[PDB]
């Protein structure tokens, strides 16, 4: 999701 920030999928 480019609309969030987080970890790898």
């Amino acid at each position, epitope marked *: *999701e*480019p609309g969030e*920030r*987080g*970890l790898k999928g």
Partner: antibody
Amino acid sequence: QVQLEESGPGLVRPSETLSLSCTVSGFPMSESYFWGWIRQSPGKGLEWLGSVIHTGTTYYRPSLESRLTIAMDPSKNQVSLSLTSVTVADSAMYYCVRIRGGSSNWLDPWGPGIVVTASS
Amino acid sequence: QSVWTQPPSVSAAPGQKVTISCSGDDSILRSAFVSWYQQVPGSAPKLVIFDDRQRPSGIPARFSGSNSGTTATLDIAGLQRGDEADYYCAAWNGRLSAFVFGSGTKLTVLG
């Protein structure tokens, strides 16, 4: 070319609020990129403060979240930072950055930076 | 951790190869894409590696990166004078739910 410029006070009194803003040129903030703030205290390392995207989604440094507000005005090509009750430990170079989010989380480009000194 | 662990100093002669390493608790780095930043005195950080091993336009292929998961690395070969700088790794930390930087490494190109 994509260019970021920081502005705000160079000298603030402790207990006052630090208000910074950043002007983006040659790139719209309506693209799917975050806009954020990093600081670097003299002779020391880098410290991510937080970031925001045009949808309204915001992330903060957990140590500073209660004192931090980071917001975006896409019409004015502006991202901003407000940090309440400034401490002497908040003296640093402050950089504005474009962030590709998702799982990438890379920072490019970086403003040249603005020196903020906190002293009574 | 709040800050990734890098060695403070690494050095080597011009023409040689150096590895700057970056690590967190256990194998935390495996879950994230690491980026690396070059900072010369007087300037802001410049991106030199992103998504573990990708080079942005302008970065030469003698710079390379990897993320084994325990330890991420920035490897710079054929050292030149202009590679002497501070290098910072960076990655998202989902346990803290924050974007974390490393403690920095000065790469001295020996003169």
